[PDB]
């Protein structure tokens, strides 16, 4: 939702932490439902038995990605000065991208994604400036 | 070899050959005369 | 406002009915008839209320092209029942 | 004057009879190389303009002459190879080398950033076909795939960079027009603007990271040791770094500081690996990383001394490393395996070639001033003004440059060759000609290389 | 088939003319459904089980596409009530307009039919009639370039190159590779439409010609990579050189004129303060090049497909535009960079 | 360690990821017009609620 | 087994048959190619070419500035007080504040 | 070929007293050659049996191509005494099938344009009898037969009508004595069990050929070499309710367009499936294709060539 | 940018036929080379001996690309002039949108090393 | 590196079961030697022979990059510490030298009087 | 005269191609005629000859 | 040089091996044959 994403750029302006974590899980949980919605259409064996299990493996993990990314953003805000930094939320993306190898016991896929998710999420916090726009009109 | 066992093409067409060599010249005349007309048109307008 | 809350709802219900399947391919073409029927009523109400007079011929033309698809697509359904025994969505070969 | 004689070299090969071919392609390219040395060497106070921008001019480009010098030299080396193949494919192949040299004439002459880039990427397609066909070794496709995987993923970021700069400030086109240059204020949006302009020339100019592009192209060689000279031209093809750093971003060079450091270990650790490796071509391939790393260190400092050393090194490496590949070609055409341990023994079979081995190996080191010492010494003296500690790192490289040349010599000086029944005939007349036509221009540049190291010199 | 095959083919030509020369909303509605009745007989042709399955999968997706498009036409009477093709005048009808046109084209979410429809086509003559068919929904999109929301066009253009770039990697069928390059190129089509509607028409010119050069060179019968493999030695070696000029041009390479769309699509977008999107365009375009990278190795290498049977008699196909069009498809970047003005 | 395995690895990672994510689109949904049309209902529901445009 | 592939070729002549040659096929053309036209590009471009590399192309005012500087040293020492350098390009220009 | 809307059309001034009569099933010896030569009174054109040199004889220029260039190590003398370890066996049969597909495509094109009685010596529908008999004894691998069946399923189904009249010859098991009586040193010293298996497989192959609504006629050795008896039976027996009887507008034209070009019909014959016996090597095939280009046959074009004809350049 | 006071049917406007057409231009010669190139590879796909010396239907291939290319360049010379004309007229009418700044010797920071 | 005395007459079994194993060493050695001897003393050879021991030697170093190193263990991370480590090491060396130099230019002049270079 | 045309049909094209390049690039001087006599750098009022700089 | 083993690895099936797609058999060379067996085939009256 567009309304939830606009709320995401108002909470870190202050020092609110307990409501910031819930705002990230509402995005990650909904985005987890989007990815899992296509997986239902990939022929699920035994309807409403393993189909619920297929939603349970994706939506819980993606919300937990948002939960850790939400929590570590608040830890990085309290410790050390200067609130607006690309390096400040880079560790948050690394810790949030660390549990991609928690879905399956491998510790290699999550470690490879740790640098990738850490850099891409930092670009979002780099995209607060005027020089970064995804969609434009004129 | 002498094109044994019935050759499909020996090329004494003159129907297609006459038109391909013909219409190309017809294209040449049509382009130059309009270019000569446009050269007179460019001088008359300005 | 009043009537348009039902005939638009009937269109969205038929929109679900097309894309949802229980192996029968005949029912999808039957819903394509309903889709054109729901489009016929929705067009009729917009033209008849706001007295256009000229646009009244347009749903009649729409009715012709409704039956154009719902026959030529129906003829292909018969060709499935010629190659295979009975028409089913599950019975396919393409990858 | 350099447009439509190389384009007139194209129908020459097709029209000529099957008995000739090689006699026409070489003779009608040597007189073309004579005219480049005749006309392009003239300079006024600053940069001239030969014509309107289709092909522009020269500012600090005697590197154009080097490509014209290699215009017949590639045809010299591929004589024993492609001698048993089809006559129609011989006509097809020479035109592909000509097309490479055609775009190479264009890239050095054109003083654009837009026209330069699309013809810089127009050298990629002919090399791809030249590598993936006539490759003597298996898995040559990995040398073809990674050739366009590493380069294009770094160079397509130029389209989002170059067009962005001209949309903000005037137009890049004429370059001498581009002195509307505003100093870069060092913002986070300008971080990726600098990186995208550099990363395109961080691939062809091999660092420590993203350097695997080079040795795979040399080990899985296009043709034995003949078309490798075109890959030497691709190494010096990253001369846009001289123009981008000078014009587009002079103020913000804080981001250059980590890239010098990355290339500083691209001097020691790239020379360490080049000590044990079995392939003779790979012992030139990894040495070519270090000598071209010298330029990447130099340019990012942006001091006037570094430009003098860099422009010299671009010409120095283009005639020394390519000469070493010709020595690798002469060994591969006899044994048919590039193993250094197997091919062991000079003077017992090859007496005259052993002196040419010396005049090519020792040029990697700083001999009596050829162009390599003149290239290196100005860069080392430029790094001291940058920082005093550099010569401790640079001095280790000076030791392993001796471990380049002498190790290539000693492993060929050991007189044995017991298993070898081949290599009975010493050398052909064209074989020794490659050794002369590469080294004698280096020997003539000992006297006065004023028209070699010239960015306002 | 005698005259009747030409008459059916002429009604697709006439069908798109109704779409092109139009002002009325029900007039273009007819123009789309004129094609629906006319592609299906050419889809069948050789009385195949694959042809019956492809046509039914083609119809049921594209019949629903038209009826979704007619909803947008009726909402244009619910609000405003003007039947002139210029604007949708609605934030609701614009959604049901763009998504309906996405169904007929090879855009991201409605792409699943494209590879399986292309496989079921009997001949190379029928394979053209999908690449040429994509002109009809593109012509309407050019007419209604404003009042259409960025959030549900640009997302469908970005995702289509992503799924197109990964959609041909696990495929060896020659028809399937061409079907996923279709999905890939449609992302480059609709991305221009907000940032100046121009160049979208030129992107068609480059695409339609370059796709037609492929299938006319595929007149020498080949359906897989392994069937197009036996062509280097058993068949003519000069034919492999000319297909190389069309394989490499479909991907982003500057010496060839297939870089001419990728010239202006990035250029026009960068003018309007957007850099993060054209970066995502060019990088994913390398995955589109990667299909042709492995497909060039079928022609450049030997690959050992010798086959004991050797053809002595020379091949005689149709080859109508197989000579004039590849010369323009290979080199036009140096010839006409000013053609942007001439086309639009 | 470095020059062959680790310094290469960075982009062979993206090659291995592109080849793995290729299967999630090509091999996924084996035939069935039911499976293709069921996904179309979801895409309309995303456009109406999630990626909201009225 | 391949039943078609096994046909190896190994023929390196060099000396056996032509006696004196640079390349294979046609000895009469070989002398005219490997020993004549290669060496004309070795003679003209390297010896007559060397009289253009550094030998008199004037070259970016290297010898011109010597005659220019020598007359300017004597001029600004006898008549002027500063020794040829004091301020660059800007004599009393527009100030910063 | 493409514009048939005018005067030239299928079954126009044709398909009356003109039919494809295939003389097949000669067991092992050349017995079908005598019957086909005798059947020249009713039938206008009689094509010889396809061999190793037929592919160069047709479409080329008179004289056949050499053994090295035409068929890669393929010879009829090698199949006379068939041996294991990298031999011919199957690749000659695949070349034999390609030649028999070529002669049938020419004969059917000769039937559609200008209606004439065409006599064929051993057709496509008799080829699997010649293969399976060799398979019964240890000669051909199991995987090669399945490769042949893949070609069989595609190439045959392109042709909608098989035959009109099929002639069946069943000789005595002492046919090897008749083969020894004939002046052929190569054909002699062949396996007697192979010829017996060829006659045994033909008996189970003639039944689906007769059931395919084509007029099948059986002949004996005493009935053979009769010009009057064979011709009278062909005229009296009329083909009824057969697959040959089809629509002239749709079925006949699509058949004529596919048989018009030799390359279009043989495009399905080349299979992408890799086989060790079917010649896979490209290195020696590159020089072999270059030798064909060096040969002064075609090399340059479909018709006109340098030092062969060419009256005008244009 | 987009079309305003221009209509379809007959590609050049004829009302604005004032600018001189391209006469013996290098742009015409390159399309003429492509017309020759199309007359080279037609003898390559359809097997005909010698691309340079073959059948003389190449004269049609040269003329067609020159003929179409001439009108295509005439459209180029028209459309680039109109796009420039509407740009110049927009500045002349409004004046307030396009601002002029002249005479400045502003202080800028100097970089070290 | 050898730790005690140079190993040549030290630590060996006194003609036990090792004698049967030592005789097996010459059996395989001569087996590879005899096939080498047959492909050497003929005048009609002309060409360097293969020797599969040296072909596999080159293949061991050039190839075996991704068939090997599929279990990325903690030892590979220790090798990575010698990889990225030295590159980040000089970041606290060159910057400390630069901040020493740049501060000396502005406050308390340390610049050379006869420095016309750069 | 008769043998030279057949043997050296291609041998003449490349040096003549240089002459074509020598002439075409020389003719580009007339396109760049702005400030030929103007702009104070080497400007001098010529009387015996018209247009000194090309 | 490429051999028969390289063509088998790049064989027409699914390019790269997958756990989900294994039963997906390659299509025939030209024109697929329908399952003609088990049909209506002339109805009977009593």
UniProtKB/Swiss-Prot annotation, chain A:
Please indicate if the UniProt record lists Membrane as a keyword: yes
Keywords carried by this UniProt record: Acetylation, Electron transport, Membrane, Mitochondrion, Mitochondrion inner membrane, Respiratory chain, Transmembrane, Transmembrane helix, Transport
Which Gene Ontology BP annotations are present?
mitochondrial electron transport, NADH to ubiquinone
Q: Report whether Electron transport shows up as a keyword of the record.
A: yes
Location of this chain's protein in the cell:
Mitochondrion inner membrane
Q: Which residues carry this modification: N-acetylalanine?
A: 1
Membrane-spanning intervals of the chain = 21-42, 57-79
Chief site of localization: mitochondrion
What membrane topology is annotated for this entry?
Answer: Multi-pass membrane protein
Gene Ontology CC terms = mitochondrial inner membrane; mitochondrion; respiratory chain complex I
Under PANTHER family, the record lists:
NADH DEHYDROGENASE [UBIQUINONE] 1 ALPHA SUBCOMPLEX SUBUNIT 11 (PTHR21382:SF1), NADH-UBIQUINONE OXIDOREDUCTASE SUBUNIT (PTHR21382)
Tell me the protein family, please. Belongs to the complex I NDUFA11 subunit family.
Q: What does this protein do?
A: Accessory subunit of the mitochondrial membrane respiratory chain NADH dehydrogenase (Complex I), that is believed not to be involved in catalysis. Complex I functions in the transfer of electrons from NADH to the respiratory chain. The immediate electron acceptor for the enzyme is believed to be ubiquinone.
Q: How does it assemble?
A: Complex I is composed of 45 different subunits.
User: How is this protein named in the record?
Assistant: NADH dehydrogenase [ubiquinone] 1 alpha subcomplex subunit 11
Give the source species.
Bos taurus (Bovine)
Gene that specifies this protein:
NDUFA11
Curated annotation (Swiss-Prot), chain C:
Gene3D superfamilies attached here? 1.10.287.3510
Task: List where in the cell it is found.
Answer: Mitochondrion inner membrane
Highest taxon above the source species: Eukaryota
**Where is coiled-coil annotated?**
none
Keywords from the named record: Electron transport, Formylation, Membrane, Mitochondrion, Mitochondrion inner membrane, NAD, Respiratory chain, Translocase, Transmembrane, Transmembrane helix, Transport, Ubiquinone
Catalysed reaction, written as an equation: a ubiquinone + NADH + 5 H(+)(in) = a ubiquinol + NAD(+) + 4 H(+)(out)
* A single MF term (Gene Ontology): NADH dehydrogenase (ubiquinone) activity
Q: Mind telling me which Pfam families this protein's record contains? A: Oxidored_q2
Q: GO biological process: any one?
A: ATP synthesis coupled electron transport
Its transmembrane ranges are 1-20, 28-48, 60-80
Membrane topology term reads:
Multi-pass membrane protein
Xref: InterPro entries: NADH_UbQ_OxRdtase_chain4L/K, NUOK/Mnh_C1-like
Q: Does this entry carry the keyword Transmembrane helix?
A: yes
Instruction: Kindly report the protein's main subcellular placement as a broad class.
Output: mitochondrion
Question: What cellular component terms from Gene Ontology apply here?
Answer: mitochondrial inner membrane; respiratory chain complex I
The enzyme's E.C. designation: 7.1.1.2
Entry function: Core subunit of the mitochondrial membrane respiratory chain NADH dehydrogenase (Complex I) which catalyzes electron transfer from NADH through the respiratory chain, using ubiquinone as an electron acceptor. Part of the enzyme membrane arm which is embedded in the lipid bilayer and involved in proton translocation.
Q: Which family does it belong to?
A: Belongs to the complex I subunit 4L family.
Tell me the subunit arrangement: Core subunit of respiratory chain NADH dehydrogenase (Complex I) which is composed of 45 different subunits.
User: Mind telling me what this protein is named?
Assistant: NADH-ubiquinone oxidoreductase chain 4L
From Swiss-Prot, chain G:
> How is this protein organized at the quaternary level?
Complex I is composed of 45 different subunits. Interacts with BCAP31.
Q: Where is this region: Disordered?
A: 1-24
What is the protein's species of origin?
Bos taurus
The entry assigns this protein to a family as follows: Belongs to the complex I NDUFB11 subunit family.
Q: Which residue windows are coiled coil?
A: none
Q: Which parts of the chain span the membrane according to its record?
A: 36-56
Say which domain of life the source belongs to: Eukaryota
Q: List the disulfide bonds.
A: none
Q: Does the keyword Transport apply?
A: yes
Q: Which UniProt keywords apply?
A: Electron transport, Membrane, Mitochondrion, Mitochondrion inner membrane, Respiratory chain, Transit peptide, Transmembrane, Transmembrane helix, Transport
What membrane topology does this protein have? Single-pass membrane protein
Biased region (Basic and acidic residues) positions are 13-24
Q: Which GO terms describe its cellular component?
A: mitochondrial inner membrane; mitochondrion; respiratory chain complex I
Please report the name of this protein according to its UniProt entry. NADH dehydrogenase [ubiquinone] 1 beta subcomplex subunit 11, mitochondrial
Keyword match ATP-binding: no
Q: What does this protein do?
A: Accessory subunit of the mitochondrial membrane respiratory chain NADH dehydrogenase (Complex I), that is believed not to be involved in catalysis. Complex I functions in the transfer of electrons from NADH to the respiratory chain. The immediate electron acceptor for the enzyme is believed to be ubiquinone.
Swiss-Prot record, chain J:
List GO terms (cellular component aspect). mitochondrial inner membrane; mitochondrion; respiratory chain complex I
The answer to keyword Oxidoreductase applying to this record is no
Tell me where in this chain the PTM Phosphoserine is found. Answer: 15
Is ATP-binding a UniProt keyword of this protein?
Answer: no
Localization per record? Mitochondrion inner membrane
* Domain of life, per lineage: Eukaryota
Q: Which UniProt keywords apply?
A: Acetylation, Electron transport, Membrane, Mitochondrion, Mitochondrion inner membrane, Phosphoprotein, Respiratory chain, Transmembrane, Transmembrane helix, Transport
Record InterPro entries: NADH_UbQ_OxRdtase_NDUFB4_su
Give the transmembrane region(s).
75-94
* Topology of this chain in the membrane: Single-pass membrane protein
Q: Name one Pfam family in it.
A: NDUF_B4
Assembly notes: Complex I is composed of 45 different subunits.
Which protein, by its recorded name, is this? NADH dehydrogenase [ubiquinone] 1 beta subcomplex subunit 4
């Amino acid at each position: 939702a567009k309304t939830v994403l606009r709320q995401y750029w108002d909470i870190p302006e202050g020092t609110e932490c307990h409501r910031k974590t819930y705002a990230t899980t509402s995005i990650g949980g909904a985005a987890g439902l989007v990815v899992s919605a296509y997986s239902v259409a990939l022929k699920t064996p035994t309807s409403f038995l393993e189909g619920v299990a297929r939603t349970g493996r994706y939506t819980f993990t993606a919300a937990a990605i948002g939960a850790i990314f939400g929590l570590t953003s608040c830890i990085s805000a309290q410790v050390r000065e200067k609130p607006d930094d690309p390096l400040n939320y880079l560790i948050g993306g690394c810790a949030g991208g660390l549990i991609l190898g928690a879905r399956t016991r491998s510790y290699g896929i999550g470690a490879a994604a740790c640098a990738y998710m850490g850099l891409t999420a930092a670009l979002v916090k780099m995209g607060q400036l005027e020089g970064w726009q995804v969609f434009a009109e004129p | 070899k002498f094109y044994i066992q019935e050759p499909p093409h020996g090329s004494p067409n003159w129907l297609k050959v006459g038109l391909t060599l013909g219409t190309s010249v017809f294209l040449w005349i049509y382009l130059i005369k309009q270019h000569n007309e446009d050269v007179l048109e460019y001088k008359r307008r300005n | 406002s009043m009537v348009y809350m039902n005939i638009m709802m009937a269109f969205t219900v038929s929109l679900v009915g097309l894309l949802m399947y229980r192996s029968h391919l005949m029912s999808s073409l039957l819903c394509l008839e309903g889709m054109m029927l729901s489009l016929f009523v929705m067009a009729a109400l917009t033209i008849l209320n706001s007295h256009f007079t000229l646009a009244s011929m347009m749903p009649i033309i729409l009715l012709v092209f409704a039956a154009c698809e719902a026959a030529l697509g129906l003829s292909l359904l018969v060709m499935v029942s010629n190659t295979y025994g009975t028409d089913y969505v599950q019975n396919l070969n393409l990858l | 004057k350099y447009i439509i004689p190389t384009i007139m070299l194209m129908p020459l090969t097709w029209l000529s009879k099957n008995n000739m071919i090689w006699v026409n392609s070489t003779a009608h390219s040597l007189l073309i190389s004579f005219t480049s040395l005749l006309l392009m060497n003239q300079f006024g106070d600053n940069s001239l303009n030969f014509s309107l921008l289709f092909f522009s001019d020269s500012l600090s480009t005697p590197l154009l002459i080097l490509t014209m010098w290699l215009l017949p030299l590639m045809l010299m080396a591929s004589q024993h190879h492609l001698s048993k193949e089809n006559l129609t494919r011989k006509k097809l192949f020479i035109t592909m080398l000509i097309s490479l040299q055609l775009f190479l004439i264009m890239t050095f002459t054109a003083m654009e950033l837009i026209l330069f880039y699309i013809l810089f990427e127009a050298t990629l397609v002919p090399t791809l076909i030249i590598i993936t066909r006539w490759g003597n070794q298996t898995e040559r496709l990995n040398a073809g795939l990674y050739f366009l995987f590493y380069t294009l993923a770094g160079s397509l970021p130029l389209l989002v960079a170059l067009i962005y700069i001209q949309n903000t400030v005037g137009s890049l086109n004429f370059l001498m027009l581009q002195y509307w240059v505003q100093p870069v204020h060092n913002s986070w949006s300008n971080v990726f603007m600098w990186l995208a302009c550099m990363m395109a020339f961080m691939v062809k100019m091999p660092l420590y990271g993203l350097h695997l592009w080079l040795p795979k192209a040399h080990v899985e060689a296009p043709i034995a040791g003949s078309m490798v000279l075109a890959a030497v031209l691709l190494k010096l093809g990253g001369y846009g770094m001289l123009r981008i750093t000078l014009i587009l971003n002079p103020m913000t060079d804080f981001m250059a500081y980590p890239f010098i450091m990355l290339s500083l270990w691209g001097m020691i650790m790239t020379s360490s690996i080049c000590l044990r490796q079995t392939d003779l071509k790979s012992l030139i391939a990894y040495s070519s990383v270090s000598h071209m790393a010298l330029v990447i260190v130099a340019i990012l400092i942006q001091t006037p001394w570094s430009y003098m050393g860099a422009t010299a090194l671009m010409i120095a490496h283009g005639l020394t490393s390519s000469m070493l590949f010709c020595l690798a070609n002469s060994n591969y055409e006899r044994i048919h395996s590039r193993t250094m341990i197997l091919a062991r023994g000079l003077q017992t079979l090859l007496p005259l070639m052993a002196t040419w081995w010396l005049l090519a190996s020792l040029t990697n080191l700083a001999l009596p001033p050829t162009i390599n010492l003149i290239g290196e010494l100005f860069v080392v003296m430029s790094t001291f003004s940058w920082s005093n500690i550099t010569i401790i790192l640079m001095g280790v490289n000076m030791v392993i440059t001796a471990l380049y040349s002498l190790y290539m010599l000693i492993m060929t000086q050991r007189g044995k060759y017991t298993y070898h029944i081949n290599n009975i005939s010493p050398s052909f007349t064209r074989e020794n000609a490659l050794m002369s036509l590469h080294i004698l221009p280096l020997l003539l540049l000992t006297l006065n290389p004023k028209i070699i190291l010239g960015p306002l010199y | 088939n005698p005259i009747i095959f030409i008459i059916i083919l002429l009604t697709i030509m006439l069908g798109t003319i109704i779409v092109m020369i139009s002002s009325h909303w029900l007039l273009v509605w007819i123009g789309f459904e004129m094609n629906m009745l006319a592609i299906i007989p050419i889809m069948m042709k050789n009385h195949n089980p694959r042809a019956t399955e492809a046509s039914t999968k083609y119809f049921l997706t594209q019949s629903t596409a038209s009826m979704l498009l007619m909803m947008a036409v009726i909402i244009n009477l619910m609000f405003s009530g003007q039947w002139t093709v210029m604007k949708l005048f609605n934030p609701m009808a614009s959604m049901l307009m763009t998504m309906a046109l996405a169904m007929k084209l090879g855009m991201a979410p409605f792409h699943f039919w494209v590879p399986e429809v292309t496989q079921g086509i009997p001949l190379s003559s029928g394979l053209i009639l999908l690449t040429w068919q994509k002109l009809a929904p593109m012509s309407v999109l050019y007419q209604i370039f404003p009042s259409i929301n960025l959030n549900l066009i640009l997302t469908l253009s970005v995702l289509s190159i992503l799924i197109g770039g990964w959609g041909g990697l696990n495929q060896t069928q020659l028809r399937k590779i061409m079907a996923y390059s279709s999905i890939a190129h449609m992302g480059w089509m609709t991305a221009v439409l907000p940032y100046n509607p121009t160049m979208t028409l030129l992107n068609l010119i480059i695409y339609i010609i370059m796709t037609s050069t492929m299938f006319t060179m595929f007149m020498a019968n080949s359906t897989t990579t392994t069937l197009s493999l036996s062509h280097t030695w058993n068949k003519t070696p000069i034919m492999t050189v000319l297909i190389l000029a069309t394989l490499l041009s479909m991907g982003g390479l500057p010496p060839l004129s297939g870089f001419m769309p990728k010239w202006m699509i990035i250029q026009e977008m960068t003018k309007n303060n957007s850099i993060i999107l054209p970066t995502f365009m060019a990088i994913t375009a390398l995955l589109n090049l990667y299909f042709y990278m492995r497909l060039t190795y079928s022609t450049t290498l030997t690959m050992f497909p010798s086959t004991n049977n050797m053809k002595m008699k020379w091949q005689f196909p149709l080859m109508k535009k197989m000579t004039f069009l590849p010369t323009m498809v290979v080199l036009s970047t140096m010839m006409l960079p000013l053609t942007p003005m001439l086309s639009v | 360690l470095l020059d062959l395995i680790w310094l290469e690895a960075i982009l062979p990672k993206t090659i291995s990821l592109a080849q793995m994510k290729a299967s999630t689109l090509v091999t996924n949904q084996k035939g069935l017009i039911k499976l293709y049309f069921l996904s179309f209902l979801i895409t309309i529901l995303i456009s109406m609620i999630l990626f909201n445009f009225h | 087994r391949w039943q078609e592939d096994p046909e190896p070729e190994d023929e390196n002549l060099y000396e056996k048959n032509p006696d004196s040659h640079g390349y294979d096929k046609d000895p009469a053309v070989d002398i005219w190619n490997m020993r004549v036209v290669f060496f004309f590009g070795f003679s003209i471009v390297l010896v007559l070419g060397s009289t253009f590399v550094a030998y008199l192309p004037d070259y970016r005012m290297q010898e011109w500035a010597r005659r220019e500087a020598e007359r300017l040293v004597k001029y600004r020492e006898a008549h002027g007080l500063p020794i040829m350098e004091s301020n660059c390009f800007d004599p009393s220009k527009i100030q910063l504040p | 070929p493409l514009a048939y809307i005018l005067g030239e059309k299928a079954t126009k001034k044709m398909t009356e007293k003109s039919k494809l009569i295939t003389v097949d099933g000669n067991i092992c010896s050349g017995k079908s050659k005598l019957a086909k030569e005798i059947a020249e009174k009713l039938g206008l054109k009689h094509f010889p049996e396809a061999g190793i040199h037929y592919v160069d004889s047709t479409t080329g220029d008179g004289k056949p191509l050499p053994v090295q260039f035409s068929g890669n190590c393929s010879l009829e003398k090698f199949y006379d005494d068939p041996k294991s370890n990298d031999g011919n066996s199957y690749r000659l049969q695949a070349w034999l099938y390609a030649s028999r597909l070529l002669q049938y495509a020419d004969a059917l094109e000769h039937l559609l344009s200008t209606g004439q009685g065409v006599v064929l010596e051993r057709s496509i529908y008799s080829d699997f009898v010649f293969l399976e008999a060799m398979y019964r004894q240890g000669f051909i691998r199991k995987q090669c037969v399945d490769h042949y069946n893949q070609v069989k399923k595609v190439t045959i189904c392109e042709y909608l009508p098989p035959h009109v009249v099929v002639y069946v010859d069943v000789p005595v098991p002492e046919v090897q004595s008749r083969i020894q009586k004939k002046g052929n040193p190569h054909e002699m010293k062949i396996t007697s069990a192979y010829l017996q298996d060829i006659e045994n497989a033909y008996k189970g192959t003639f039944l689906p050929e007769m059931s395919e609504k084509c007029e099948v006629l059986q002949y004996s050795a005493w009935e053979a070499q009769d010009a009057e008896k064979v011709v009278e039976d062909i005229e009296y027996l009329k083909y009824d309710k057969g697959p040959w009887l089809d629509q002239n507008d749709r079925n006949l034209h699509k058949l004529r367009m596919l048989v018009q070009d030799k390359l279009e019909v043989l495009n399905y014959t080349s299979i992408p499936v890799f086989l060790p016996e079917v010649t896979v090597g490209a290195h020696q095939s590159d020089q072999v294709f270059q030798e064909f280009t060096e040969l002064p046959g075609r090399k340059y074009r479909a018709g006109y060539n340098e030092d062969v004809g060419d009256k005008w350049i244009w | 940018g987009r079309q305003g006071r221009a209509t379809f049917q007959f590609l050049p406007d004829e009302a604005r036929s004032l600018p001189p057409p391209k006469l013996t231009d290098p742009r015409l010669a390159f399309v003429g080379f492509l017309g020759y190139c199309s007359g080279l590879i037609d003898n390559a796909i359809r097997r005909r001996p010698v691309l340079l010396a073959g059948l003389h239907r190449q004269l049609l291939y040269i003329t067609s690309f020159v003929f179409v290319g001439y009108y295509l360049l005439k459209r180029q010379d028209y459309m680039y002039a109109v796009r420039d004309h509407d740009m110049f007229s927009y500045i002349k009418s409004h004046x307030x949108x396009x601002x002029x700044x002249x005479x400045x010797x502003x202080x800028x920071x100097x970089x070290x090393x | 590196s050898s730790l005690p005395t140079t190993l040549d007459p030290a630590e060996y079994d006194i003609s036990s079961e090792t004698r049967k194993a030592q005789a097996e060493r010459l059996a395989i050695r001569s087996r590879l030697k005899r096939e080498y001897q047959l492909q050497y003393y003929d005048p009609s050879r002309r060409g360097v022979i293969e020797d599969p021991a040296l072909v596999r030697w080159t293949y061991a170093r050039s190839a075996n990059i991704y068939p090997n190193f599929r279990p990325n263990t903690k030892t590979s991370l220790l090798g990575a510490l010698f990889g990225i480590g030295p590159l980040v090491f000089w970041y606290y060396v060159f910057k400390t030298d630069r901040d020493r130099k740049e501060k000396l230019i502005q406050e308390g002049k340390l610049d050379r009087t006869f420095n016309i270079s750069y | 005269l008769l043998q030279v045309v057949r043997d050296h049909w291609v041998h003449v094209l490349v040096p003549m191609g240089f002459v074509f390049g020598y002439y075409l690039d020389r003719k580009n001087d007339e396109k760049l005629t702005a400030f030929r006599n103007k702009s104070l750098l080497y400007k001098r009022e010529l009387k015996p000859n018209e247009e000194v700089t090309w | 040089q490429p051999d028969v083993e390289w063509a088998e690895q790049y064989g027409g099936a699914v390019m790269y091996p997958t756990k989900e797609t294994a039963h997906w058999k390659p299509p025939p060379w030209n024109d697929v044959d329908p399952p003609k067996d088990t049909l209506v085939s002339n109805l009977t009256l009593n």
